[PDB]
Structure 1
Amino acid sequence: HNKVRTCWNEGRPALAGWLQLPGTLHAEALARLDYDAVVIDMQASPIDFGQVAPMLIAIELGGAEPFVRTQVNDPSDIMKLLDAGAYGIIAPMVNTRAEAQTLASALHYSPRGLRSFGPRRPSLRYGSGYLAQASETVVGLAMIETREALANIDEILSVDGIDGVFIGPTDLALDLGHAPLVDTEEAEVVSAIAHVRERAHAAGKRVGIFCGSGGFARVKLAEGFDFVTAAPDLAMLSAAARQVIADARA
């Protein structure tokens, strides 16, 4: 079973890791922590497909559901990843109902979508009965990180075949005319985010958000978020080394 979906079915949210660094060793290492999922970021990173492919295997062995935030909302790229044992897709810059249908169409075999049939790695996981349950095995979120996304939120949330939406808070803050700051106090950004969540849950759909600290993720979890990511590997690693250095040199 999909571990995030089994979180949701058992009435609780998922906490996910977020990797910008390529490779299998930190991926597995983080996956064995009390993360329900680890997201590989193929957008704001040097991670291409050759590197993602072994990292999905690493996360699954680690005991976390492999998730990928794609470079772009592209049906054929999303389908390749599904076939490689990506079991969650987060599509950036989903701004319209049409783009969200485009996302949906990639996540589901006909007749519900137009997903190409060749399930190399999921067939090994789920076996010859994969077709029947393929849809439930995969989690699909549209990212909301523009003013336009915000305006089209109900129409995006109308789209059958996506589990929910995922807030890109830095892109969202920037396009709102504010500082691209993670975990921001900026009142407009904060109200926009709360508005996205309320609309999502009213549409009976799931909402997630990207966090830069445990402190902030704790708060989002308390406010009812279903899928919270904290924190990117490079940011935690950078912060950790800065502390090691200041402690060593004090």
Structure 2
Amino acid sequence: MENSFKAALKAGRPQIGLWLGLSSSYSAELLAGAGFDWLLIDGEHAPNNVQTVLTQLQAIAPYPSQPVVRPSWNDPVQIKQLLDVGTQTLLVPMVQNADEAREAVRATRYPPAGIRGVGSALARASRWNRIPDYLQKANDQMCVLVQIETREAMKNLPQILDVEGVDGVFIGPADLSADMGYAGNPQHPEVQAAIEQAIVQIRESGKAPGILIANEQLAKRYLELGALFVAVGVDTTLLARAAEALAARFG
């Protein structure tokens, strides 16, 4: 139950990821063999729930690619449920301030370090109580990544970076650009400056910067600035664009 993604971040090894929105355990397996370091199972903007997360975790399990799950909100009940099905790395949307970051962290930890509900006999997370001393080992292998998605969050970043248990800070360029007045479109100097400044500041605190970016040149730029978990494409996009380009080549 060692969290190898968490360990790679702490060691400064950049992790290249693919976003999964196809909400299918079958395509998840197909993509798990493609060579990524991590895969993001999106519970916020794709039609997933705890049960489909579970089947995608099962599909991914024998492969080297490490799963990360995005809950629909920073909701301790939903987080509890995701952790019991075996989630160990969470990408939490819309974290606006340090109090919210701390709540995300505490939702992942058993008392006294947090408020995670205890239900080990029933949980894939403990392999139904086969993992010895699960209750004592679990807190240390949880990896909490928080998303900053607004001007308010950018302003609070220093305080967020000070929250123990926040392992990574992810910048969401679509939401951030929208909040900044550019309608979800991030290729604007002001948006890029905000993104790049944050990446530097995050890395300077010893924490991992993350981002999703489908432009490969920008992905490399962010990596050069110190980003450590970078998602470089989206399954639905890869499929739709490849199919459309193919059809067009035949008229």
TM-score bracket, normalised by the shorter chain, equals over 0.9
Q: How does 1:30-179 map to 2 (within 5 A)?
A: 30-119=31-120, 120-124=123-127, 127-179=131-183
SS of the aligned residue for 2:136 comes to helix
Q: Structure 1 residues 185-194 or 69-78, which shifts more?
A: 185-194
Q: Partners in 2 of 1:194 and 1:216 — Cα distance?
A: 10
8 Å CA contact retained: 1:104, 1:113: yes
AA at the equivalent of 1:73: N
Unpaired runs of 5+ in structure 1? none
1:128 CA displacement: 1.4
Residue 22 (1) aligns with residue 26 (2) = no
Counterpart residue type for residue 203 of structure 1:
S
Q: Specify every segment of 5 or more residues in structure 2 that has no aligned partner in the other structure, as ranges.
A: none
Q: Distance in 2 between matches of 1:30 and 1:44?
A: 19
Deviations 1:55-97 (A, max 9, x none): 1111222332221111100011011101111121011110111
TM-score (norm 2): 0.92
Q: After superposition, give the CA deviation of every residue in 1:72-129 in whole Å (9 maximum; x if it has no partner).
A: 0001101110111112101111011111111011121122111112241221298113
Counterpart-to-counterpart distance in 1, 2:91 and 2:163: 15
Q: Percent identity?
A: 36
SS at match of 1:61: coil
Cα distance in 2 for partners of 1:218, 1:204 equals 20
Across the two proteins, how many residue pairs are aligned to each other? Answer: 247
Asked if the contact 1:108–1:161 (Cα under 8 Å) also holds between the matched residues in 2, the reply is no
Aligned mates of 1:136, 1:231 — CA distance in 2: 30
CA distance in 1, matches of 2:11, 2:144: 19
Q: Report the Cα offset of residue 9 of structure 1.
A: 4.5
Distance (Å, rounded) in 2 between the aligned partners of 1:101 and 1:10: 23
Q: Pairwise CA RMSD of aligned residues? A: 1.7
Distance 1:117 1:67, change over 3 A: same
Q: Secondary structure at the match of 1:180?
A: coil
From the superposition, tell whether residues 72 and 108 of structure 1 become closer, same or farther in structure 2 (CA, over 3 Å).
same
Contact 2:199 2:225 (C-alpha < 8 Å) held by counterparts: no
Further displaced range: 140-149 or 5-14 = 5-14
**What amino acid is the match of 1:20?**
G
